[PDB]
Design a protein around this ligand. Structure first.
Ligand SMILES: CCCCCCCCCCCCCCCCCC(=O)OC[C@H](COP(=O)([O-])OCC(O)COP(=O)([O-])OC[C@@H](COC(=O)CCCCCCCCCCCCCCCCC)OC(=O)CCCCCCCCCCCCCCCCC)OC(=O)CCCCCCCCCCCCCCCCC
Ligand SMILES: CCCCCCCCCCCCCCCCCC(=O)OC[C@H](COP(=O)(O)OCCN)OC(=O)CCCCCCCCCCCCCCCCC
Ligand code: SF4
Ligand code: SF4
Ligand code: SF4
Ligand code: SF4
Ligand code: FES
Ligand SMILES: [K+]
Ligand SMILES: [Zn+2]
Lengths: 206, 94, 125, 176, 94, 263, 114, 48, 112, 379
């Protein structure tokens, strides 16, 4: 069918089997395992399992996920633990990708994964900067993207798009100064969602 | 259809003009108020009404796919003409 | 090892929000009303949190709507009103909660359109 | 399939060693580099004589915006606001009301040319070919304010450039 | 393309290449700047029958993830081990 | 004791006798597409957008009007149901005018949105379209009746809610037209509500005409003060200006209506 | 009510880190005023440090106090290492911001805000 | 035009010395090309 | 004996067979300190025993590399060192114990 | 130890020097952080597309391709074959654009200014191909979920063939200046050596991996569009230093011409965006004649298409390495979260490691060998 993305059942079966494999070996930490319809395997774990689970996937002979593709967070305010920490790993040996997810709130530290992947260093700094998640035992945790002295964590869903302050050069004090943000044209909020359900397959029970 | 207010400022086709006491007209001092002189309301009025033989006519604005979406205009009312909602051309059943 | 913490969760000192936009704001927690222009009910499933509307004024140059309210566009989504209230509480915003309005179940009967002796009989179809 | 960029063994015979000695002492590869730049000295340069000569463009070029008319002179824009909705930069601001003859027309049509990313989405979205990005790219100004276009400026652009705009649309509309 | 034969010889010798065969300036070999109009083809959904959208609706064939384990025999790898790459036969070594 | 068991895509649900198929689907969060059906008007059954397959039954049923029977399994997403929706949407759009850019309903149109969700993505209508003359019914409601899909919602609202029998259908077949026949103004204290219930841009607000698009409006939920009823309303604003007033549903006060003064 | 700690297991442990941070900031102000060639006095800088500490005196959650200390140490590191420029240091003082009205009548005259 | 020149140098304009009351003997500008010649000079088309 | 593994920093191994026998044997010893019913022990002993049997059954290095499918024999040795390092860490982590804590009810629910 | 506070975009390097030797490199970035990821959450999926042109703004159409593939994967639709070939054709043209910028500005930074001018006249000609299909020389916004915006204009493929026919000679001229030059080799040979194992653990990708002998290229191992249908070789280094990585990039340009040649010959006929008007807008002529087409046009340009809920990590072999997005859909027409994985982010994080035991002037060469654009590093 020309316009429909083809399914790949062989990869779906392989990833499902490996997902059970990981869940059998680390039951102490694995809370949920799922494979998407486009064949991406996700392991959901208790946050205590970050170091053991990542080490296992990096070092075990049937995993060998030697490359950390990405590490990031997602803010979901409706959840008690609003921050979802996502590790995307790549195994060159088995030409495969896996995603490991855990969670944390505003006040609970997450163990730094720098010991497992040196790549995690700056990704964790970015998460701290943009989301305010504190990583424990980081060699050097500090802002990386925002201006010096910047207050707040801009990528949180409740941080306003244009922020709270803005900069200009002031002649009287002969320097750039920060002042509360005023916009000549306010950003125009659009309500785009259709009131008609699009995807029955994802309907939530009432 | 450009006319000047009592203070001399040209009135736009949207009717905009600064009133006598508005400071904002200082922006034109030493410069100019940009006004387009081809008022579309006046230009469309000059187009003749088109006489047709049917109760229903269609308009796409001319130029096929270079015009506007094709719409069908009912011409049953004899008091008035049928007007295209996109381009303003008028039609009348003879 | 875990510790015991009995204080109410409060993060107002570590969120970076200026004091003005914590104490003087009023968060509204509600389920959006169905847009009366459409029959679809899919935009009434979730809880929303918005803030009180503040001044918008005309930009002297172009006439655009200017604002000084950093929260003017902020709108959060929540599964339940407990989740929304929990979020409002820990951020120090005072709030109002409006109970969800659900259309009440109606009794429909096509046959009533042709009642022998009742007023429900329709004069036209 | 792969190949090695840099995996070769130098020949250690006397002739090859002496060849590398000559290169080291007589700077042969450096002289060979001088030959390349010498050959460019005697090539015709690629420079064009701007502004008397211009770089080639195509009918699809996305330049300064303009509001277009029908052949009768009536505005094409009917204030549908599709351009305003799609604008990735929110560079467009529109207000509309019924005209004195009942036509659906805009009373405000502003493009902040310093917000605009010149992406062309507005002219894709427009159902009546009203807003277009024209061929002009030589409209730099001395002040920020001059780049905040209102409807009069955009209608004037359309009247100024319509001769070229129409011809470019004629060349490309069959790809759209 | 206007260089005298002596200068052409000089720069070819200095560079070691036949530069005139592959000039980096463009002349008449480029396509005309006016072309005949296209006539583009239409896609596979351009049919008058046997074309119901529900049989070609990719978005609606998406499904939520399959949960293989929830907290509510031979070893395996995530996929077969990758095959060794083969050395290029076009040019194995630079 | 009174309740009977029916199934919606295999999921059991208990409903009072007389519950329609459409209402049984609401109970599990499934909204059947509709045009003519409005839960505050009498059932009509004429648009046919709500056709739905009943498992083991060869004929689709009009969910809005069919009372659900015990043991029925309502297949809201079957191939038969989907093809029924596509076919109906195809007929609704055959004569509909290409008006969306100039039509005030655009962006909040049930015809647009149900076409997007349940209709095909293209046309195979190769003929010319119907065009219908416009009716003047007063200074509040503009009529562009070429957009009318003959759902008869306005007729039922006028007769049942407003208690005014001035709207009806004249003619027959494809030429059937909604109006007053004679030149008559529909001036009722509740007349403006026909703008809301008209699924398309056939009936639109004259004062509001052309001023705004739905996606750009901010919605402020407020209360009416034009009388002592306390009607719940939504105030639509854009860039600091009040654009229009809409009803807000409150079962115990104004339901989903407001008076013309409030509006 | 059983949560993972950051650094401190109780308020007494947390209040030690606060005092250590305060001392570090107190001793850094004289060098900050000199290195950045600020026009404020050393007393002003320390008065500003104290003011920043005092607005957080009502906190009783050790995890929140830990994060405030964590953030306060990052701010100190930015200053001692001259990652900050002069503009960043002086942003604490809001020199170009005119004094907003605080009493009811003043706020009433100028606008609608509470 | 001179089509023996390489593409880009094969078309050029010698600006007028006076346009719209402005002395343009030395002060020429790319914006002086009217739209009908703008298409040709920029090779947006082949025919003048 | 090959002259280079082709990977920067990965030295050629003169005696790959002896090195692998030592490593795989070391792994089976560490695994003996894990409970018998832990899935990590059962699975790792299975794969380790398969590789060890391949090593003993094939004296030619290039043919052994084909059997193992782990890349260069020097890569296979490095993986054995990684598994041995992992096996020792698992003894302290004990991931075969029951789940430490279930998540909140909607933790993994999406969309919200 | 002297401290130097200062030593593509703009970078702030804080270095510790012991004489000539670099003891610490601390890149301070964020000077081009523009909150792109947060801005994308306020855009429809189409409105977000132009943000990807402005990340690695040397490889515009490859960034577009990565985002388009990610959205196409969540949509569960497939772009048509001609669109796939165009995307590969312009993906490799884009690789030539990037590698010219990478190699000649790397050369320009250490004093060899002349190849920059020769090769930027070739970039100027590829900018014309961009402008001819899209109307823009750089930020084309041409590759979109569902295919490409417009079909190629008549005559474009002939001009691409003419350009490709002569380009390898231009690479040869570049190589005559640098490859065997003893000064160039002195500046790059044994500079910034990274081991295969270190490269993987530090999250390197692309030439930062292959220069060290790792046999990995996503076009070969995890192919997308029609890359499985074209033949080419992956260049591999042996010493993991700057000189080998320079050689890999030069050889990659040659293989790009090889791929481009096959794309020109194998270009098929047909449509250039998915024939599904609930995703890709209809043709303008249909929008102006058919009721369904107009409705779908109206909705796709206002609300946009809804994307079924889910999350995907999608990656491509961009000119600078693995470029991916972690794209989270909540079921609506606006992405809920869009994390952009930029290859230069991990590479720059490894500058301090790579610069150990080197001199100040080598820090310039190492930053150059990494191919750093701060549009994608800072986002
Ligand atoms: C060394 C200088 C030698 C003097 C002779 C130079 C000469 O005439 O060659 C031009 C002539 C044209 O060059 P081309 O690139 O092959 O052709 C391009 C077009 O055909 C060119 O032709 P076209 O079809 O494009 O026609 C356009 C052009 C036609 O071109 C011309 O009219 C030629 C103008 C060149 C005259 C140079 C006079 C030399 C005075 C010597 C004193 C200066 C040095 C001190 O007309 C003009 O634009 C005239 C503009 C006048 C420019 C100013 C020239 C005067 C300079 C002296 C100023 C003194 C005050 O070249 C030859 O005929 C070959 C022999 C020239 C000697 C080559 C030796 C190269 C050096 C050896 C390697 C060492 C590297 C270290
Ligand atoms: C029978 C009895 C006879 C007795 C007498 C015998 C003596 C003659 C035979 C011996 C010949 C001696 C040649 C002397 C020239 C100097 C050679 C030299 O020093 O070159 C070596 C130098 C470094 O070479 P390198 O590859 O970096 O590494 C080697 C050490 N590790 O490499 C360099 O110096 C490179 C220079 C870098 C500068 C580049 C810019 C210059 C390039 C253009 C040069 C043009 C030629 C100059 C002509 C001047 C004309 C006035
Ligand atoms: S070109 Fe793009 S950014 Fe500029 S006004 Fe049009 S849609 Fe907006
Ligand atoms: S320019 Fe076109 S798209 Fe924009 S409002 Fe006018 S008619 Fe609509
Ligand atoms: S009623 Fe709906 S479908 Fe019909 S023209 Fe208006 S917006 Fe379009
Ligand atoms: S005017 Fe509107 S409400 Fe009345 S029948 Fe027609 S579509 Fe239905
Ligand atoms: S909604 Fe049931 S037939 Fe109209
Ligand atoms: K309506
Ligand atoms: Zn018309």
């Amino acid at each position: 069918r020309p316009t429909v993305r083809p399914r790949n059942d062989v990869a779906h079966k392989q990833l499902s089997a490996f997902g059970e494999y990981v869940a059998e070996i680390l039951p102490k930490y694995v809370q949920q395992v799922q494979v998407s319809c486009f064949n991406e395997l996700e392991i959901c774990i208790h946050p205590d399992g970050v170091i053991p689970v990542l080490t296992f996937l990096r070092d075990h002979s049937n995993a060998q996920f030697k490359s950390l593709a990405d590490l990031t967070a997602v803010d979901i305010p409706t959840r008690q633990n609003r921050f979802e920490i996502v590790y995307n790993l790549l195994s060159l040996r088995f030409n495969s990708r896996i995603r490991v997810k855990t969670y944390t709130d505003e006040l609970t530290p997450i163990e730094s994964s720098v010991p497992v992947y040196k790549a995690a260093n700056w990704y964790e700094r970015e998460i701290w900067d943009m989301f305010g998640v504190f990583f424990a035992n980081h060699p050097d945790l500090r802002r990386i993207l925002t201006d010096y002295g910047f207050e707040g964590h801009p990528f949180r869903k409740d941080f306003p798009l244009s922020g709270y302050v803005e900069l200009r050069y002031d002649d009287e004090v002969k320097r750039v100064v920060a002042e509360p943000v005023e916009l000549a044209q306010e950003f125009r909020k659009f309500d785009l969602n259709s009131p008609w359900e699009a995807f029955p397959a994802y309907r939530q029970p009432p | 259809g450009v006319r000047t207010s009592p203070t001399g400022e040209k009135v736009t086709h949207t009717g905009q003009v600064y009133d006598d006491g508005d400071y904002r007209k200082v922006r034109f001092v030493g410069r100019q108020k940009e006004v387009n002189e081809n008022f579309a309301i006046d230009l469309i009025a000059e187009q003749p009404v088109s006489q047709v033989g049917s109760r229903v006519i269609s308009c796409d604005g001319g130029g096929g796919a270079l015009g506007h979406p094709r719409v069908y205009i009912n011409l049953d009312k004899e008091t008035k003409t049928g007007t295209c909602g996109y381009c303003g051309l008028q039609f009348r059943q003879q | 090892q875990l510790i015991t913490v009995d204080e109410k969760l409060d993060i107002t000192t570590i969120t970076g929000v200026p004091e003005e936009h914590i104490k003087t704001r009023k968060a509204r927690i509600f389920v959006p009303a169905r847009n009366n222009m459409q029959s679809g009910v899919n935009n009434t499933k979730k809880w929303k949190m918005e803030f009180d509307t503040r001044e918008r004024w005309e930009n002297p140059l172009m006439g655009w709507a200017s604002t000084a309210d950093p929260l003017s566009n902020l709108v959060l989504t929540f599964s339940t009103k407990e989740d929304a209230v929990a979020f409002a509480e820990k951020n120090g915003w005072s709030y109002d909660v409006e109970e969800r309005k659900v259309p009440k179940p109606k009794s429909k009967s096509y046959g009533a359109n042709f009642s022998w002796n009742k007023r429900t009989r329709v004069s036209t179809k | 399939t792969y190949k090695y960029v840099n995996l070769r063994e130098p020949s250690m015979d006397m002739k090859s060693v002496t060849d590398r000695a000559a290169q080291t002492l007589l700077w042969t590869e450096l002289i060979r580099g001088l030959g390349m730049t010498l050959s460019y000295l005697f090539r015709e340069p690629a420079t064009i004589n701007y502004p008397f000569e211009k770089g080639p463009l195509s009918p699809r070029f996305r330049g300064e915006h303009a509001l277009r008319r029908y052949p009768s002179g009536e505005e094409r824009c009917i204030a549908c606001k599709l351009c305003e909705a799609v604008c990735p930069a929110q560079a467009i601001t529109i207000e509309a009301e019924p005209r004195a003859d009942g036509s659906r027309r805009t009373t405000r049509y502003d493009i902040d040319m310093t917000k605009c990313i010149y992406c062309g989405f507005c002219q894709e979205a427009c159902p009546v070919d009203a807003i277009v990005e024209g061929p002009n790219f030589e409209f730099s100004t001395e002040t920020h304010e001059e780049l905040l276009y209102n409807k009069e400026k955009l209608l004037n652009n359309g009247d100024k450039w319509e001769a070229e705009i129409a011809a470019n649309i004629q060349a490309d509309y069959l790809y759209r | 393309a206007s260089a005298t034969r002596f200068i052409q010889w000089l720069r070819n010798w200095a560079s070691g290449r036949d530069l005139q065969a592959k000039l980096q300036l463009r002349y008449q070999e480029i396509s005309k700047r006016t072309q005949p109009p296209p006539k583009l083809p239409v896609g596979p959904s351009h049919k008058l029958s046997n074309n119901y959208y529900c049989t070609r609706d990719g978005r609606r064939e998406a499904m939520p993830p399959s949960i293989v384990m929830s907290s509510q025999k031979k070893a395996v790898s995530p996929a077969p081990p990758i095959k060794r790459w083969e050395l290029s036969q076009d040019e194995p070594y630079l | 004791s009174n309740l009977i068991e029916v199934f919606v895509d295999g999921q059991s649900v208990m409903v009072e006798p007389g519950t329609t198929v459409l209402q049984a689907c609401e109970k599990v969060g499934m909204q059947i597409p509709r045009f003519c059906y409005h839960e505050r008007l009498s059932v009509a059954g004429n648009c046919r957008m709500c056709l739905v397959e009943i498992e083991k039954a060869p004929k689709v049923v009009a969910a809005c009007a069919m009372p659900v029977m015990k043991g029925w399994n309502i297949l809201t997403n079957s191939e038969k149901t989907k093809k029924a929706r596509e076919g109906v949407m195809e007929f609704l759009l055959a004569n509909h005018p290409l008006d969306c850019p100039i039509c005030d309903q655009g962006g909040e149109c049930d015809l647009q949105d149900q076409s997007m969700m349940f209709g095909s993505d293209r046309s195979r209508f190769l003929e010319g379209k119907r065009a219908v003359e416009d009716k003047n019914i007063g200074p509040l409601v503009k009529t562009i009746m070429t957009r009318c899909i003959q759902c008869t919602r306005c007729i039922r609202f006028a007769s049942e809610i407003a208690g005014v029998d001035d709207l009806g259908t004249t003619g027959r077949g494809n030429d059937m037209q909604v109006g007053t026949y004679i030149e008559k103004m529909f001036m009722s204290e509740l007349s403006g509500n026909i703008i809301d219930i008209c699924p398309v841009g056939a009936l639109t607000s004259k004062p509001y005409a052309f001023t705004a698009r739905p996606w750009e409006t901010r919605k402020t939920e407020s209360i009416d003060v034009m009388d002592a009823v306390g009607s719940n309303i939504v105030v639509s604003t854009r860039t600091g200006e009040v654009m229009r007033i809409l009803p807000r549903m409150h079962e115990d006060i104004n339901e989903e209506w407001i008076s013309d003064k409030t509006r | 009510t059983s949560v993972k700690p950051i650094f401190s297991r109780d308020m007494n442990e947390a209040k030690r880190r606060v005092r250590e941070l305060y001392r570090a900031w107190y001793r850094e102000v004289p060098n900050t005023v000199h290195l950045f060639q600020l026009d404020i006095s050393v007393k002003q800088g320390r008065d500003k440090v104290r003011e920043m500490f005092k607005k957080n005196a009502h906190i009783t959650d050790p995890r929140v106090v830990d994060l405030l200390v964590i953030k306060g140490k990052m701010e100190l590191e930015e200053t001692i290492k001259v990652w900050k420029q002069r503009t960043h240091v002086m942003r604490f003082f809001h020199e170009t911001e005119a004094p907003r009205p605080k009493d009811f009548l003043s706020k009433f005259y100028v606008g609608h805000d509470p | 035009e001179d089509n023996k020149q390489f593409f880009g140098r094969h078309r050029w304009v010698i600006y007028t010395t006076e346009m719209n009351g402005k002395n343009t003997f030395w002060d020429v500008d790319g914006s002086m090309v009217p739209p009908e010649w703008h298409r040709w000079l920029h090779c947006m088309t082949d025919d003048p | 004996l090959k002259k280079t593994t082709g990977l920067v920093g990965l030295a050629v191994c003169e005696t790959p067979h002896e090195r692998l026998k030592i490593l795989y044997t070391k792994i089976l010893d560490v695994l003996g300190h894990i409970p018998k019913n832990a899935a990590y022990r059962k699975y790792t002993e299975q794969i380790t025993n398969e590789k060890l049997s391949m090593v003993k059954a094939e004296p030619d290095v290039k043919k052994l590399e084909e059997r193992l499918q782990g890349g260069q024999i020097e890569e296979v040795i490095l993986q054995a060192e990684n598994e041995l390092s992992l096996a020792r860490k698992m003894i302290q982590w004990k991931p075969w114990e029951p789940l430490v804590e279930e998540p909140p009810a909607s933790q993994w629910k999406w969309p919200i | 130890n002297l401290t130097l506070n200062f030593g593509h975009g703009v970078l702030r390097l804080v270095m510790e020097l012991s004489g000539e030797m670099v003891r610490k490199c601390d890149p301070h970035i964020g000077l081009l952080h523009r909150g792109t990821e947060k801005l994308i959450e306020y855009k429809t999926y189409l409105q977000a597309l132009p943000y990807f042109d402005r990340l690695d703004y040397v490889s515009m159409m490859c960034n577009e391709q990565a985002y388009s593939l990610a959205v196409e994967k969540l949509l569960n639709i497939r772009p048509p074959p001609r669109a796939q070939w165009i995307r590969v054709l312009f993906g490799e043209i884009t690789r030539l654009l990037n590698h010219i910028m990478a190699v000649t500005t790397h050369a320009l930074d250490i004093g060899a200014m002349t190849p920059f001018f020769w090769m930027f006249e070739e970039r100027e000609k590829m900018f014309e191909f961009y402008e001819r299909v899209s109307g823009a020389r750089m930020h084309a916004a041409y590759v979109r979920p569902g295919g490409v915006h417009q079909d190629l204009p008549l005559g474009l493929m002939d001009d691409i063939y003419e350009f490709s026919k002569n380009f390898s000679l231009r690479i040869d001229e570049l190589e005559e200046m640098l490859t065997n030059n003893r000064i160039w080799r002195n500046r790059t040979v044994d500079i910034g050596i990274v081991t295969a194992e270190d490269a993987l653990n530090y999250g390197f990708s692309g030439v930062m991996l292959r220069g060290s002998g790792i046999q990995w290229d996503l076009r070969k191992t995890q192919p997308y569009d029609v890359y499985d249908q074209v033949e080419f070789d992956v260049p591999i280094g042996s010493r993991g230093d700057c000189y080998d990585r320079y050689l890999c990039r030069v050889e990659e340009m040659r293989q790009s011409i090889r791929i481009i040649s096959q794309c020109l010959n194998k270009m098929p006929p047909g449509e250039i965006k998915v024939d599904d008007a609930k995703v890709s807008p209809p043709k303008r002529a249909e929008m102006k004649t058919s009721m369904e087409s107009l409705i779908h046009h109206f909705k796709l340009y206002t609300e946009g298409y809804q994307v079924p809920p889910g999350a995907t990590y999608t990656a491509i072999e961009a000119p600078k390495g693995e470029f991916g997005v972690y794209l989270v859909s909540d079921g609506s027409s606006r992405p809920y979260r869009c994390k952009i994985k930029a290859p230069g982010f991990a590479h720059l994080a490894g500058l301090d490691k790579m610069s150990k035991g080197h001199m100040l002037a080598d820090v310039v060469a190492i930053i150059g060998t990494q191919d750093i654009v701060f549009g994608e590093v800072d986002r």
